[PDB]
Design a protein around this ligand. Sequence first.
Ligand code: 7H9
Ligand code: ZN
Length: 100
Amino acid sequence: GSHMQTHAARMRTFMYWPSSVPVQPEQLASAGFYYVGRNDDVKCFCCDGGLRCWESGDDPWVEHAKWFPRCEFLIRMKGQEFVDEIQGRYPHLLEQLLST
Ligand SMILES: C[C@@H]1CN(CC(=O)N2CC(C)(C)c3ncc(Cc4ccc(F)cc4)cc32)[C@@H](CN2CCOC[C@H]2C)C[NH2+]1
Ligand SMILES: [Zn+2]
């Protein structure tokens, strides 16, 4: 999309985020997601991928890589190797583990 490109702008959309959803605004906004204003529906500012029905223990970066692996914002922030491993591809696991 053309909006919500900054972390601060994404955070502002969470003003009416329901307090009972077990995933928090900071986690979502960091992973590129902003609140669309209905239920627990979020969208990525970059790939426009939509996610809902957040569950306790969900990791927004893992959900981003599981559903929208070609997102250029996801790749810039987390790197192609992170996305590959979420997609079940491990030819570069040792180097990944070593590098960090
Ligand atoms: C966090 C986790 C996500 N998960 C998948 C999910 O949310 N995806 C996967 C898919 C990309 C196929 C998809 N496409 C449309 C919508 C709808 C939408 C959401 C936001 C929005 F702004 C506008 C529309 C959701 C959605 C949940 C399980 N989902 C729940 C829905 O049915 C599919 C199922 C697999 C569990 N929680
Ligand atoms: Zn995205």
